[PDB]
C-alpha cells in the first residue's frame, strides 16, 4: 500500500499441443519474414 513492491500474482498455464502449435506457427512466420526482408534492422541496445 505504500508502493514498495508489486508482485505479478498469476501463473501462466497453457495447453501443451496448443502451445506447440502456436510456437510452430510463429517459427514458420519468422522464417518467412527473414527470407522476405532484404534489410532486417536489429535494434540497438540498451534501448534508452
Amino acid at each position: 500500500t505504500s508502493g514498495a513492491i508489486t508482485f505479478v500474482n498469476e501463473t501462466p498455464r497453457v495447453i501443451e499441443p496448443v502451445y506447440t502449435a502456436q510456437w510452430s506457427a510463429t517459427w514458420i512466420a519468422m522464417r518467412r519474414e527473414k527470407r522476405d526482408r532484404t534489410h532486417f534492422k536489429r535494434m540497438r541496445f540498451p534501448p534508452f
Binding site: 514458420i28 522464417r31 518467412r32 527470407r35 532484404t38 534489410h39 534492422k41 536489429r42 540497438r44
Partner: protein, 69 residues
C-alpha cells in the same frame, strides 16, 4: 521431396510454407563489422520517410538603439 511445397530441395520438416491438408542471401564477408552491421542491404527507405516528413512539416511552416546609433 517436400510434400506440400513441391520443390526438390528440402525435407518436409523444413518447408517454409504452411502445412496443408493435402531468394537472395548475404554473401559471406567475414569482417566483424560486416556481419554485425545494423544497416546492411540498406536501400534508403528510412531516410526517405524522414525527408518526406520534414518536407511536409516545412510545407506546413511556410532595429538600432538611440545611443547605439
Amino acid at each position: 521431396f517436400c510434400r506440400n511445397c513441391g520443390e526438390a530441395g528440402h525435407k518436409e520438416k523444413d518447408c517454409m510454407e504452411k502445412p496443408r491438408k493435402m531468394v537472395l542471401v548475404r554473401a559471406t564477408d567475414d569482417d566483424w563489422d560486416s556481419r554485425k552491421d545494423r544497416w546492411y542491404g540498406y536501400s534508403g527507405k528510412e531516410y526517405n520517410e524522414l525527408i518526406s516528413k520534414w518536407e511536409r512539416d516545412k510545407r506546413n511552416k511556410i532595429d538600432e538603439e538611440i545611443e547605439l546609433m
